Design a protein around this ligand. Structure first.
Ligand SMILES: [Mg+2]
Ligand SMILES: [Mg+2]
Ligand SMILES: [Mg+2]
Ligand SMILES: [Mg+2]
Ligand SMILES: [Mg+2]
Ligand SMILES: [Zn+2]
Lengths: 102, 221, 135, 83, 88
RNA sequence: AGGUUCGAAGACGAUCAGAUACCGUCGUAGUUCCGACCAUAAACGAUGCCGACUGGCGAUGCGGCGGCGUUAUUCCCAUGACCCGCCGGGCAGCUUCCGGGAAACCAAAGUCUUUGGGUUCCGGGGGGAGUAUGGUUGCAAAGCUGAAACUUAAAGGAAUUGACGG
């Protein structure tokens, strides 16, 4: 039986999308089907921020960010626990997870 | 009514405009567009008070037509309206369910709180969907207070005022009680009612304690 | 660790509090004696478990209105509910602010030209409708 | 609404619909007397005109054809005629 | 370019942005317009200048995206190339 | 013609009881372009095309129309960026006791025993079998058209409860 109304991808008004390579196994995934993730992590890894800050030669220096965009195949996203299986009514929920701000 | 005695009498227009009762935006339900006048520049819909008044009078007629007064059942899930339905049942003789409506009140004949009413008046169709559905089960006609975005599924005498502000809810329950008691003989309809409409207003605990400490410090001094 | 009271103790204590609130206090031993002499509790352990929960519940009641319900708490609840009808109505603003659109609505239903009805200008705008999507 | 009256609509609902899909279809276009400064005669330019119309006396451009409606040139009076 | 004893005298060779700044500007729901021009200064230092610009969301805008149409992108790019050429 | 990178075949190193595999190192044809063939895909929305009717809502893309204001040149009218709506044609979404359906679900898969708008292709228990044979197309690989003998009481679909899941 048909599991999802979209067929697991965002392909609505076109015939073909260009494939990409999964970032940790290099499987060909269609670009609309892939699990994409944007990472804006710090270079200086804030557990070690104070040593770099006190060893710096400048007085006011702001640490650079690292900007990587990740593409996962379904299998790598499941195995690396980026996504998880959900129930039916939980499956059709499209909201991103909460930002855990406090 | 088309009668001159059942006309608007602008004192209550001042009550309406003071409480709100004519501001209901910003979403419009497609069966409620018969009662709006137009839309403000800031997105709020304006409700025509003639339609509100005459739907209220029609509801009062339907409530009066019940011979046994303790067969009208008044419902409010939210507190802002719990106080109003308790005082409405005190004034007119209805039967209130203020607070949680246990499912199966109208359908499960075995259980202890099995009420079997002949009319049902509801503060919010969206907040009181369970009594509306059970009324659909037990062929029970329904009156409701409806905002511009309230779905009218099992509603018959939808009265289009406002149900967000505490003042508008208390005021409309007040005028429903006044019209019901005036269509029966209790008030001679020439001098104003002695019950002031502030009696039905919701009071959150923080302003209650602020008012009570202000009254205490005024009384002791 | 592992001292949850079962529903026997909890509902027995609730009925005891509801019926005999006037003779109980926040002292375990006098509550123990009262519960001994107003209820046929078959065992001593159940008796003083019930008495301990009664003591805990009376500390809770002395703080605030838990269920309940005490007659004093309920009469003061309906006193707050019933009284404070104010000496002056909250709907007697004596200056009512209206949109000119509502002024025109009243004007076409024959009440827009005899009331007080202080009017403002409409808000130049149409910046309602919070922005779509995240940020 | 189960009892919408389909053969007496309000004029605002009539104007709101498509130019077809009305009870009796009618165009949204019109004609107009266009007067340019510096001349004396008027011209009867169509509203949704596709031609670059010219005043015959003074060879000047009256309207510029656009996607939906002719855009008249810099300041020129126009009077919509017979509505 | 030349040595004067204990000194190495330098001359201009090129300009670039840092990696994190360029990665920080590029984000979704907007159009990126880039242009490049080959162009010679008066003294014979033929250069290649690269430009970049991003469409801006208005302050009262409530639509999610700010996308320029293709003709708008083309004339913005034309303006970029003509300005860089006339400047250098 | 060209051959960077990948990489069927192949060689080797591992892993393994075995390992002509999965993992690693190298590597032919191919992958690229030009010219000529082939006509197949889970070539899928697993849903023929044309037309009509039947709920709501919020967006989005193109075109048009109309409106408070903000912004750009420029000081004005245009013209762009935004804001609030309406109409048309699109890709879709949410919601709904419209109705349907074995159900999953579907605003089409509805308007069907209350059965008829027009029309094309196509199925008839599971196998044997898309095989044999004839014909026909192709350089080939293969494509299209396409049985029978014989065999069998189920094969399937969608949901439910358990059991099991490296
Ligand atoms: Mg499966
Ligand atoms: Mg395809
Ligand atoms: Mg290699
Ligand atoms: Mg090839
Ligand atoms: Mg068969
Ligand atoms: Zn992968």
């Amino acid at each position: 039986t048909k599991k999802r109304r979209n067929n697991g991808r965002a392909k609505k008004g076109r015939g073909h999308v260009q494939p990409i390579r999964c970032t940790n196994c290099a499987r060909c995934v269609p670009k609309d089907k892939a699990i994409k993730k944007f990472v804006i992590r710090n270079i200086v890894e804030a557990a070690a921020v104070r040593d770099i800050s006190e060893a710096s030669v400048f007085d006011a220096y702001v640490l650079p960010k690292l900007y990587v965009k990740l593409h996962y195949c379904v299998s790598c996203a499941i195995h690396s626990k980026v996504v998880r299986n959900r129930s039916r009514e939980a499956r059709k929920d499209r909201t991103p997870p909460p930002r855990f701000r406090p | 009514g088309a009668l001159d005695v059942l006309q608007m009498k602008e004192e209550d227009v001042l009550k309406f405009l003071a409480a709100g009762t004519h501001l209901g935006g910003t979403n419009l339900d497609f069966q409620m567009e018969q009662y709006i006048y137009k839309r403000k520049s800031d997105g709020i819909y304006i409700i025509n008070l003639k339609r509100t008044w005459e739907k209220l009078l029609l509801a009062a007629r339907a409530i009066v037509a019940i011979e046994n007064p303790a067969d009208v059942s008044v419902i409010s899930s939210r507190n802002t309206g719990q106080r109003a339905v308790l005082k409405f049942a005190a004034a007119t003789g209805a039967t209130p369910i203020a607070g949680r409506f246990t499912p199966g009140t109208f359908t499960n004949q075995i259980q202890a709180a099995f009420r079997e009413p002949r009319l049902l008046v509801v503060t919010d169709p969206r907040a009181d969907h369970q009594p509306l559905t059970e009324a659909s089960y037990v062929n029970l006609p329904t009156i409701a207070l409806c905002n511009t975005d309230s779905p009218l599924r099992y509603v018959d005498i939808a009265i289009p005022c406002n149900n967000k502000g505490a003042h508008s809810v208390g005021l409309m329950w007040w005028m429903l009680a006044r019209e019901v008691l005036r269509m029966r003989g209790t008030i001679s309809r020439e001098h104003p009612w002695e019950v002031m409409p502030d009696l039905y207003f919701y009071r959150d605990p923080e302003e209650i304690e602020k008012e009570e400490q202000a009254a205490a410090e005024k009384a002791v001094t | 660790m592992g001292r949850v009271r079962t529903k026997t103790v909890k509902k027995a204590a609730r009925v005891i509090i509801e019926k005999y609130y006037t003779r109980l206090g926040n002292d375990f031993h006098t509550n123990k004696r009262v519960c001994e002499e107003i209820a046929i509790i078959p065992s001593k352990k159940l008796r003083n478990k019930i008495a301990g929960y009664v003591t805990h519940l009376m500390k809770r009641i002395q703080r605030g209105p838990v269920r309940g319900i005490s007659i004093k708490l309920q009469e003061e609840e309906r006193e707050r509910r019933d009284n404070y009808v104010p000496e002056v109505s909250a709907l007697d603003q004596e200056i009512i602010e209206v949109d000119p659109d509502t002024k025109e609505m009243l004007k076409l239903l024959d009440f827009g030209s005899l009331s007080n009805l202080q009017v403002t200008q409409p808000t130049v705008g149409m910046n309602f409708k919070t922005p779509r999507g995240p940020v | 609404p189960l009892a919408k009256d389909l053969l007496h609509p309000s004029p605002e609902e009539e104007k709101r619909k498509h130019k077809k899909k009305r009870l009796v279809q009618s165009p949204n276009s019109y004609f107009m007397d266009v007067k340019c400064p510096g001349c004396y005669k008027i011209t009867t330019v169509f509203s949704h005109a596709q031609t670059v119309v010219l005043c015959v006396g003074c060879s000047t451009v009256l309207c510029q054809p656009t996607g939906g409606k002719a855009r008249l040139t810099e300041g020129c009076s126009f009077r919509r005629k017979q509505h | 370019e030349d040595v004067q004893g204990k000194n190495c005298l330098t001359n201009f060779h090129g300009m670039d942005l840092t990696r994190d700044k360029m990665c920080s500007m590029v984000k979704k729901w907007q159009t990126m317009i880039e242009a490049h021009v080959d162009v010679k200064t008066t003294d014979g230092y033929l250069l290649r200048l690269f430009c970049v610009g991003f469409t801006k969301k208005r302050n009262n805008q409530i639509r999610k995206t700010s996308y320029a149409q293709h003709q708008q992108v083309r004339q913005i790019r034309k303006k970029m190339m003509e300005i860089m050429t006339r400047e250098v």
